[PDB]
Amino acid sequence: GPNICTTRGVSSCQQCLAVSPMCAWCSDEALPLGSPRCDLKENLLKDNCAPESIEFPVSEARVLEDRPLSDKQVTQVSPQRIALRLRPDDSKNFSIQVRQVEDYPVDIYYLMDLSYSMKDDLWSIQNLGTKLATQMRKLTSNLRIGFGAFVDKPVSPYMYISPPEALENPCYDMKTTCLPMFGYKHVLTLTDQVTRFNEEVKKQSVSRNRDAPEGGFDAIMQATVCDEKIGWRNDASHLLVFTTDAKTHIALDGRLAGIVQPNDGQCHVGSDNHYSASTTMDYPSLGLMTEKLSQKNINLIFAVTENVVNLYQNYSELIPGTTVGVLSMDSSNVLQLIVDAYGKIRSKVELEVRDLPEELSLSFNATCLNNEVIPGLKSCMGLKIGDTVSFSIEAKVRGCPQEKEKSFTIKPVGFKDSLIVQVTFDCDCACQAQAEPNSHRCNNGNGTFECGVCR
Amino acid sequence: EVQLQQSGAELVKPGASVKLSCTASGFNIKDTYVHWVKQRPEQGLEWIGRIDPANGYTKYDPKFQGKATITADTSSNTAYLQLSSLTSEDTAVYYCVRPLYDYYAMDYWGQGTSVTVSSAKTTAPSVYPLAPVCTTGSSVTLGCLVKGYFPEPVTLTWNSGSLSSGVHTFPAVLQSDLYTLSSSVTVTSSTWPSQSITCNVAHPASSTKVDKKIEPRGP
Amino acid sequence: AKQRGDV
Amino acid sequence: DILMTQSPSSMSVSLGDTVSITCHASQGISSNIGWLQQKPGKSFMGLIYYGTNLVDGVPSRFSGSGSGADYSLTISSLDSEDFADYYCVQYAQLPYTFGGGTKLEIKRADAAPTVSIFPPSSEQLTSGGASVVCFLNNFYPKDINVKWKIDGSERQNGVLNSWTDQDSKDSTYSMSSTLTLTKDEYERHNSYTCEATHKTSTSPIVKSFNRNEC
Amino acid sequence: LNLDPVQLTFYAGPNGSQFGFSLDFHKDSHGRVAIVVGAPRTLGPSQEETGGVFLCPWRAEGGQCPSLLFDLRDETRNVGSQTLQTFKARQGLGASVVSWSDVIVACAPWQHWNVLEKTEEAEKTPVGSCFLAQPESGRRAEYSPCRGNTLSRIYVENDFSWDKRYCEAGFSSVVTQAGELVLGAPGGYYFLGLLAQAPVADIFSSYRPGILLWHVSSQSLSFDSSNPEYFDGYWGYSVAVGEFDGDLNTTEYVVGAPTWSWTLGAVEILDSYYQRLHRLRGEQMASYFGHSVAVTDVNGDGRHDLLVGAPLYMESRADRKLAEVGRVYLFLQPRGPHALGAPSLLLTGTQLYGRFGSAIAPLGDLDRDGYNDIAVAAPYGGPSGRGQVLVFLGQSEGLRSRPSQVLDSPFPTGSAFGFSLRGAVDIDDNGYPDLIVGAYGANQVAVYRAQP
Ligand SMILES: *[C@@H]1O[C@H](CO)[C@@H](O[C@@H]2O[C@H](CO)[C@@H](O[C@@H]3O[C@H](CO[C@H]4O[C@H](CO[C@H]5O[C@H](CO)[C@@H](O)[C@H](O)[C@@H]5O)[C@@H](O)[C@H](O[C@H]5O[C@H](CO)[C@@H](O)[C@H](O)[C@@H]5O)[C@@H]4O)[C@@H](O)[C@H](O[C@H]4O[C@H](CO)[C@@H](O)[C@H](O)[C@@H]4O)[C@@H]3O)[C@H](O)[C@H]2NC(C)=O)[C@H](O)[C@H]1NC(C)=O
Ligand SMILES: *[C@@H]1O[C@H](CO)[C@@H](O[C@@H]2O[C@H](CO)[C@@H](O[C@@H]3O[C@H](CO[C@H]4O[C@H](CO)[C@@H](O)[C@H](O)[C@@H]4O)[C@@H](O)[C@H](O[C@H]4O[C@H](CO)[C@@H](O)[C@H](O)[C@@H]4O)[C@@H]3O)[C@H](O)[C@H]2NC(C)=O)[C@H](O)[C@H]1NC(C)=O
Ligand SMILES: *[C@@H]1O[C@H](CO)[C@@H](O)[C@H](O)[C@H]1NC(C)=O
Ligand SMILES: *[C@@H]1O[C@H](CO)[C@@H](O)[C@H](O)[C@H]1NC(C)=O
Ligand SMILES: *[C@@H]1O[C@H](CO)[C@@H](O)[C@H](O)[C@H]1NC(C)=O
Ligand SMILES: [Ca+2]
Ligand SMILES: [Ca+2]
Ligand SMILES: [Ca+2]
Ligand SMILES: [Ca+2]
Ligand SMILES: [Ca+2]
Ligand SMILES: [Ca+2]
Ligand SMILES: [Mg+2]
């Protein structure tokens, strides 16, 4: 029978709005005394209340900033700023779109075999290095690239130890010069300074040792486990590109240098950027390399010359997830591996809210790649660069706050972009503005006359 | 038993070449360095050079560089010394040598190979009896002179070998490309001329045998 | 093939 | 090259003696020295290598010693088989070089030679040559000098000498000397003489003949 | 089954010495059994690491051992216009030790050697060297078959053929019953590897101090090859002897080449002329198949069987995953002139990174049931990773898959308990063969006695 608007005091227009969103107030003075002023709008119109005198706020959402989503500043959320106007206890919905525009973060660390066999391959590894740097920068602006070099454990019989001149110049007996032998040397931390990386890579030259198999597995292990030195980012794809033209030393080989201590899988680089345990600790086993690679989320790529591809392919099957490409004068083969790896990268859009007032509460409907509205959801998964998702958010205010103008932010996790929602609370009627301070009609110590009523 | 077996005596012409061999017996030639040494009566022992038959690497005394060539052949377990441009200074005995244990030592020697460099043609000796002059004591000494033969050796005996005590047969000496030798025999005076004493000289190279009865000199 | 070192 | 000076060049010793042969290198050869033995008419046998080590089979009476540039071989209690030649060889440097050698000789009492002179045989004189032979036999010690005189004048050219090794039985030495001249010159002189000079006398032993006189 | 794990005897060397890296039983002329222990990082008398050897007399309480003396002075010889040099610093004397008759052979695989000649040289390189002692007489000899006097240039001019400069002679070693010393030299011929054989008698009779380069006429070395399968194969990393050709007059050699054929690994059975009689190939790359080899008849038929260790073998596990545990392969010798076949049994380690098969020791007949037995070492095995030694008894079928007994390391982490092992000898004269276990990391040796 009776409704909530009429049957709840309603001494004023304000109290009328406070009762419920469906309530409307009649200001028409020509309305009869019997009729209620606080009622449903339909009941008022039906009881001859003047259409202009009917007070009935309607909650609204207004886009303020609606810069379009980018293609190829960078805008990944649209719209960027909305104005919500709510009446007591009411709600209002609005739409938000999120696009993955920005390129994905990728770390490439590059291990250069600088043993003497690589004299004829030096150009090839310099080319591959600079091509990795340059071309991957075109694929992703969030590349960080760095490199290190290795020869072998600088100890007899791997190292030439006579005559004394041979230590500073391993090429002494050939009447030429090369660099002193070293185990593993970290040269350049993962950086986005591509031009510099290329310069340093072009400055590298070979050293020399005695035996064909080299100590690159020491370098792989240290490049994997030395977090701060190499500079792998937490939320980034990690690629470790390993170059060589020869077979490689493996765990238990070290006994030929009198080295029997098993590899501990710990970092031993530090200040001078050399692997300090090179001459005291054995080469790592495949099982231990596997464990650390997996544990540090690093993908190993063997970029090796054709004469040893089959060897490294075979090691690759024993270190799952590892891939092999061919080091040559042409960089295409190895580059395809990285591009393919980049092609497998997926991302998510997970909305989080910041500074949501006590009074307000939100609910979300996610519309993801499958184009199906999953209600109550605020995250989509499996996005690639270019994909867009959409959410519908509904904000509901509890009663009417005294604060009257608040704001919060809806932000996808890991995105700079955001939506600022400016909330205004509309609890007053328009006729209050016209108050008429002087009572006139009350005249019993009441004061003022608004919307056709006394106190 | 380690034993180095050298090739036989050589008689060769000046300006020619000769190649001496040394065969391993009871071991393999490649086991050690093999050296070649020269010996002469007056000048003594001179080292010529060595070879490592495992790889053929050689070393020479500069004095013999470009005259001596040492080689080896592991198939026949033999080491060789070749001397080119033969001269009278190359007349010598030549030995191959190897160490026992010490890589660098000179412990085991072959029996030697004699090389004689000469232009001389084969020439039979003249054999002359030497009877005493004219008082007579308790012993008498007779002799035999063998002149102008080539090459060595000759075999000289008295009474077909029956008289051997009290004999001195002197080493042959080279004078102007031919050899000369002499022998003395001493007996008691009652033995000679009462009993017949004869010089017996054999020179295989010229296929000659000569007997010379020592006769007392007369008026 | 012949050479087995770092060459 | 390293010069190896060996000393003495000979020694006259007896059975049962202990003897030393020394070798002086022209520089230090840090025991890189061998000692060798060559018996009369035989080849070589190695005795010592690297200063002091006996070659397998060599008797214990042989021993090596020394250092730097100066070395010795000692033979303790000489056996009859030890009368032989001995040589050092160095192998510090190439070329390997040898000592001059030491001859171990048998000691015995001095003995004068028995000198016999022989005129040319008739057979030789028919050929047109003339040889006068003189044997100086069974003397000791080995050093000796022969002088030929024709009619009192000393004759030097055309003399050929040969010496035997130490005799096996009496340990003496012997020498043969032949003066060959032309039959033409031979028949122009009367007196032919061979004079032996030896330590057993201060005056020489003279043997002579006058041509055609019997 | 019956090694007593409670009543252990501990022998100890000096801190940092690696006492226990290698060991063997040694029996003197009177028949008394001692234990030779190798300690390759023992300080020499001038505070430089040279290695050393200790001869331990049998005592229940164990304790310290006397040091078996060897010359640790470097040598130089100027001879033949060359300068020969030995370098004994860091040579690792005692990296292997083996006893035969009244002789102890202790090797220094990293002893270095050089030859200078004017401005040229051979190169200072680890030729290795073995030291031979006859304790009851004091006689000493050496054997160093890889030393040469060839200059660096000549190797270059001959494409590095017959290059024995990096042999590490005595890396492994074994002696035949007749008294032939066989040495493994895995760096031989530019890291192919080689074997060097010579009678102990002849080593003694041909050696004199100060010579440095000398001939052992009766010696016999294996050959160089141009077959790339052999390159960097470390042929001679391990060595053993046995009877595999039915002719009791001939002795056969067993050689480990753990990186043979691009790290596939191999073990070879050879005649004494080094003709290959059989090759056993590795199952998995980098597994180090051939790290250890052992010869013993385990199934009672009088035919020697072969055991090979691959201590870095990775076992397949669920979800395409691999676990480094080690493996041992048993090859039973069949009757007649037939080849060794596929393995009769595979024993696989169960602890991650345990290096099961790092050492394999014939124990003889531990329980006197008629069948010979073995011990296998997992030097980082057990739940804690302190190390483990597992005993397997022989039977008609070969070996059992389940060990009869597990010996847990009594030493702390890092001891490498089990890295060396020897059995088949009755040290206390109770009529049952006993086991000695080295823990070089803890500088000690544990003796386990077999009980009824
Ligand atoms: C997230 O997405 C969801 C889904 O799209 C969306 O949900 C809607 O939310 C709004 C308000 O938030 C709902 O509005 C209410 O609707 C009430 C009546 O709903 C009934 O009628 C619907 C229409 O029925 C016809 O058509 C359909 C399809 O054409 C057909 O199936 C029917 O047979 C019939 O022909 C019907 O869809 C709806 O069904 C839903 O609800 C039932 C019951 O829970 C459920 O069983 C179904 O499975 C289905 O989910 C239902 O049958 C209406 O009474 C109500 O009005 C009262 O309340 C408001 C205040 O809230 C007062 O103003 C008013 O005076 C009344 O007191 C209100 O209008 C709408 O129905 C939802 N739709 C669905 C499908 O669930 C959210 O909005 C999205 N969120 C965001 C943030 O975007
Ligand atoms: C990387 O890993 C691969 C795969 O494991 C290795 O390639 C294999 O090498 C093995 C040797 O280890 C080869 O084995 C040989 O197989 C032959 C038969 O195979 C036929 O069919 C395959 C089908 O894939 C063909 O590709 C192939 O051409 C053959 O026609 C046998 O005939 C061989 O037997 C001989 O040797 C064995 C011992 O090895 C003896 O027992 C036999 O009596 C006989 O003498 C042999 O079994 C095999 O061919 C290779 N497989 C493949 C797929 O290529 C690589 O060597 C390895 N590379 C590196 C660098 O480590
Ligand atoms: C939001 O709610 C309004 C009611 O004013 C309705 O018109 C609109 O269709 C709704 N949109 C979504 C996405 O829920
Ligand atoms: C070995 O070193 C440890 C400390 O690392 C020390 O406590 C111990 O006394 C040493 N042992 C001996 C026998 O010196
Ligand atoms: C073994 O054979 C060799 C020939 O190679 C022979 O000399 C030896 O006597 C044989 N041994 C036996 C016990 O017959
Ligand atoms: Ca190359
Ligand atoms: Ca190397
Ligand atoms: Ca046999
Ligand atoms: Ca058997
Ligand atoms: Ca048993
Ligand atoms: Ca016992
Ligand atoms: Mg290289």
Laid out side by side, the sheet with A373-375 consists of A77-78, A91-99, A388-397, A360-367, A373-375
What is the torsional sign of CA E11, E13, E15, E20?
negative
Q: Does E157 touch chain C (CB under 8 A)?
A: no
CA proximity to A166, closest of E123, B144, E298: E123
CA proximity to B202, closest of B153, B163, B143: B153
D206 and D124 in a common domain: yes
Per-residue burial over A155-177, b if 16 or more Cβ lie within 10 Å, else e, is bbbbbbbbbeebeebbbbbeeee
What is the torsional sign of CA D53, D57, D60, D64?
negative
**CA pair distance D124, E155, nearest whole angstrom:** 70
The helix (H) or strand (E) run that includes residue E449 is none
DSSP 8-class letter at E58: P
**CA pair distance B150, B178, nearest whole angstrom:** 5
Cβ proximity of A185 and A123 under 8 Å: no
A325 and A386 in a common domain: no
Residue type, A221: M
Residue whose Cα lies nearest atom 41 of ligand 2: it is: E281
For residue A71 the two structure tokens come to 């293609």
CA D139 to chain CA centroid, nearest Å = 13
A109 and A234 in a common domain: yes
Coil/strand/helix, residue D106: strand
A44 and A127 in a common domain: no
B88 to each of B82, D102, E63, how far by Cα in Å?
Answer: 16, 26, 78
Q: What residues flank ligand 3, with Cβ below 6 Å? A: A 93, 392
Q: Within 13 Å of residue E89, how many CA atoms lie on the same side as its CB?
A: 6
Cβ proximity of B34 and B98 under 8 Å: yes
**CA pair distance A29, A52, nearest whole angstrom:** 12
- For residue A95, count other CB atoms closer than 10 A to its CB: 16
Q: Which atom of ligand 2 is nearest to the CA of A311?
A: 60
DSSP string, A326-361: E-SS--HHHHHHHHHHHHT--EEEEEEEES--SSEE
**CA pair distance E422, E33, nearest whole angstrom:** 13
DSSP string, B118-174: --PPPBPPEEEEE-------SEEEEEEEEEEEBSS--EEEEGGGTB-TTEEEPPPEE
**CA pair distance E115, E165, nearest whole angstrom:** 11
Structural domains in chain D (count):
2
Residue A36: CATH number of its domain: 3.30.1680.10
CA of A361 to the centre of ligand 1 (A): 19
Q: Which residue has tokens 């595999």?
A: E244
Per-residue burial over E279-312, b if 16 or more Cβ lie within 10 Å, else e, is bbebbbbbbbbbbbbbbbbbbeeebbbbbbbbbb
To the nearest whole Å, the CA of E5 is away from the closest chain C CA by 49
Cβ proximity of E379 and E416 under 8 Å: yes
Domain end (from A57, A75, A91): A57
Cβ proximity of D89 and D96 under 8 Å: yes
**CA pair distance E450, E367, nearest whole angstrom:** 8
Residue of A nearest to E151 (CA): A173
Q: Which residues of B touch D120 (CB under 8 A)?
A: 128
DSSP string, A182-228: -SEEEEEEEES-HHHHHHHHHH------SBSSB-HHHHHHHHHH-HH
D183 and D168 in a common domain: yes
**CA pair distance E257, E260, nearest whole angstrom:** 5
CB pairs under 8 A between A and C: 16
Q: Which one of 2.60.40.10, 3.40.50.300, 3.20.20.70, 3.20.20.140 gives the CATH number of domain B120-214?
A: 2.60.40.10
DSSP string, E315-340: EEETTTEEEE--EEEEE---SSSPPP
Residues in chain B: 219
CA of E393 to the centre of ligand 10 (A): 5
**CA pair distance E347, E376, nearest whole angstrom:** 10
How wide is the angle at C-alpha D4 spanned by C-alphas D2 and D5, nearest 5°? 140
**CA pair distance E192, E195, nearest whole angstrom:** 11
Q: Does D45 touch chain B (CB under 8 A)?
A: yes
Q: Who's near A347: CB < 8 A, 6+ residues apart? A: A100, A104, A383, A384
A203 and A141 in a common domain: yes
- For residue E30, count other CB atoms closer than 10 A to its CB: 7
Expressed in Å, this structure's resolution amounts to: 2.6
A426 and A386 in a common domain: yes
Cβ proximity of B143 and D135 under 8 Å: yes
| Burial (Cβ within 10 Å: 0-12, 13-18, ≥19) of residue A365 | middle
φ, ψ (nearest 5 deg) of residue D156 = -100, -50
**CA pair distance A378, A29, nearest whole angstrom:** 50
**CA pair distance A200, A194, nearest whole angstrom:** 10
Q: Does E79 touch chain B (CB under 8 A)?
A: yes
φ, ψ (nearest 5 deg) of residue E311 = -75, -10
**CA pair distance A214, A183, nearest whole angstrom:** 9
Residue type, B10: E
φ, ψ (nearest 5 deg) of residue A197 = -50, -45
Q: In this complex, does chain B touch chain D, defined as having at least 3 beta-carbon pairs under 8 Å apart? A: yes
D188 to each of D148, D160, D212, how far by Cα in Å?
Answer: 16, 22, 12
Q: Which residues of C touch A212 (CB under 8 A)?
A: 4-6
D113 and D207 in a common domain: yes
CA proximity to E65, closest of E108, E130, E14, E25: E14
**CA pair distance D113, D203, nearest whole angstrom:** 13
A405 and A314 in a common domain: no
Was domain B1-119 assigned CATH 2.60.40.10? yes
**CA pair distance E38, A86, nearest whole angstrom:** 89
DSSP 8-class letter at E104: E
CA A384 to chain CA centroid, nearest Å = 12
CA of E176 to the centre of ligand 8 (A): 12
Q: Is A20 in the pocket of ligand 1 (CB under 6 A)?
A: no
E210 to each of A54, B210, D33, how far by Cα in Å?
Answer: 124, 61, 13
Residue of C nearest to E227 (CA): C1
How wide is the angle at C-alpha E364 spanned by C-alphas E360 and E368, nearest 5°? 135
DSSP 8-class letter at C5: B
φ, ψ (nearest 5 deg) of residue D77 = 65, 80
Coil/strand/helix, residue A10: coil
D125 to each of A62, B147, D182, E64, E401, how far by Cα in Å?
Answer: 160, 13, 9, 100, 111
B84 to each of B13, B50, B71, how far by Cα in Å?
Answer: 11, 17, 14
Q: Is B76 left (phi over 0), alpha (psi -120 to 50) or beta?
A: alpha
**CA pair distance E272, E239, nearest whole angstrom:** 13
**CA pair distance D148, D136, nearest whole angstrom:** 13
φ, ψ (nearest 5 deg) of residue B178 = -115, 155
Coil/strand/helix, residue E228: helix
**CA pair distance E254, E236, nearest whole angstrom:** 9
Cβ proximity of A64 and A45 under 8 Å: no
Instruction: Extract the runs of DSSP E, i.e. beta strands, from chain B.
Output: 3-6, 10-12, 18-25, 34-40, 44-52, 57-60, 68-73, 78-83, 92-98, 108-109, 113-117, 126-130, 139-149, 155-158, 167-169, 173-175, 178-188, 198-203, 208-213
DSSP string, D12-71: EE-TT--EEEEEEESS--TT-EEEEEE-TT--EEEEEETTTEEPTT--TTEEEEEETTEE
**CA pair distance E102, D178, nearest whole angstrom:** 71
Q: Which residue has tokens 């190897």?
A: B98
Per-residue burial over E77-88, b if 16 or more Cβ lie within 10 Å, else e, is bebbebebbbbb
Q: Which atom of ligand 2 is nearest to the CA of E262?
A: 61
Q: Is A310 in the pocket of ligand 2 (CB under 6 A)?
A: yes
- For residue E156, count other CB atoms closer than 10 A to its CB: 12
Cβ proximity of E183 and E221 under 8 Å: no
**CA pair distance A105, B189, nearest whole angstrom:** 131
A233 and A118 in a common domain: yes
**CA pair distance A347, A387, nearest whole angstrom:** 10
DSSP 8-class letter at E63: B
D203 and D112 in a common domain: yes
**CA pair distance B13, A114, nearest whole angstrom:** 66
Cβ proximity of D3 and D95 under 8 Å: no
Judged by its nearest atom, the ligand closest to the C-alpha of residue E303 is 9
Q: Does E77 touch chain D (CB under 8 A)?
A: yes
SS3 content of chain D, % helix, strand, coil (to 5): 5, 50, 45
Tell me the residue range of the domain where D101 lies: 1-107
For residue A327 the two structure tokens come to 């080091």
**CA pair distance E49, E71, nearest whole angstrom:** 14
| Burial (Cβ within 10 Å: 0-12, 13-18, ≥19) of residue A439 | middle
Cβ proximity of A117 and A156 under 8 Å: no
Neighbours of chain B (3+ CB pairs under 8 A): D, E
Residues forming a β-bridge with E100: E103
Residue A203: CATH number of its domain: 3.40.50.410
CA proximity to E360, closest of E376, E378, E337, E384: E376
Cβ proximity of D90 and D25 under 8 Å: yes
CA proximity to E82, closest of E111, E113, E126: E113
Q: Which residue has tokens 């030549």?
A: B94
D145 and D185 in a common domain: yes
Residue type, E290: G
Q: Which residues of A touch E190 (CB under 8 A)?
A: 211
Tell me the residue range of the domain where A403 lies: 58-100+346-455
CA-based end-to-end distance of chain C? 10
Helix segments in E116-206, DSSP class H: 152-157, 188-191, 200-206
φ, ψ (nearest 5 deg) of residue A43 = -65, -35
For residue D108 the two structure tokens come to 């015995």
- For residue E225, count other CB atoms closer than 10 A to its CB: 13
DSSP 8-class letter at E260: H
What residues does the ion ligand 7 have nearby, CB within 5 Å?
A: A 152, 158, 209, 211, 214
CA A308 to chain CA centroid, nearest Å = 38
CA proximity to E64, closest of E5, E135, E133, E10: E10
Residue type, A316: S
CATH number given to E1-452: 2.130.10.130
Interface of D with B in 54-73 (CB under 8 A): 55-56
Helix segments in E237-328, DSSP class H: 260-263
Cβ proximity of D196 and D161 under 8 Å: no
Q: Is A375 in the pocket of ligand 1 (CB under 6 A)?
A: yes
CA proximity to A17, closest of A435, A447, A406, A432: A432
The helix (H) or strand (E) run that includes residue A21 is none
Q: Within 13 Å of residue C5, how many CA atoms lie on the same side as its CB?
A: 16
**CA pair distance A284, A315, nearest whole angstrom:** 13
CA proximity to D209, closest of D106, D141, D129, D119: D119
How wide is the angle at C-alpha A37 spanned by C-alphas A35 and A39, nearest 5°? 95
Residues forming a β-bridge with B163: B158
DSSP 8-class letter at A84: E
Residue whose Cα lies nearest atom 10 of ligand 3: it is: A93
Helix segments in E169-218, DSSP class H: 188-191, 200-206
Task: Please give the radius of gyration of chain E, using alpha carbons only, rounded to the nearest integer.
Answer: 21
Probe target for ligand 3 pocket from A84, A93, A367, A377, with the most ligand atoms within 8 Å of CB: A93
Residue of D nearest to E81 (CA): D93
Cβ proximity of A366 and A373 under 8 Å: yes
Domain locations in chain E as residue ranges: 1-452
**CA pair distance B86, A339, nearest whole angstrom:** 81
Residue A69: CATH number of its domain: 2.60.40.1510
To the nearest whole Å, the CA of D93 is away from the closest chain E CA by 4
Coil/strand/helix, residue E205: helix
Residue D136: CATH number of its domain: 2.60.40.10
Domain locations in chain B as residue ranges: 1-119, 120-214
H and E: helices and strands count for chain C: 0, 0
DSSP string, A261-311: SPP-------TTSB-TTTTTSPPPPHHHHHHHHHHTTEEEEEEE-GGGHHH
The DSSP bridge pattern shows strands A298-304 and A323-326 to be parallel
Residue type, B146: V
Structural domains in chain A (count):
3
CA A16 to chain CA centroid, nearest Å = 48
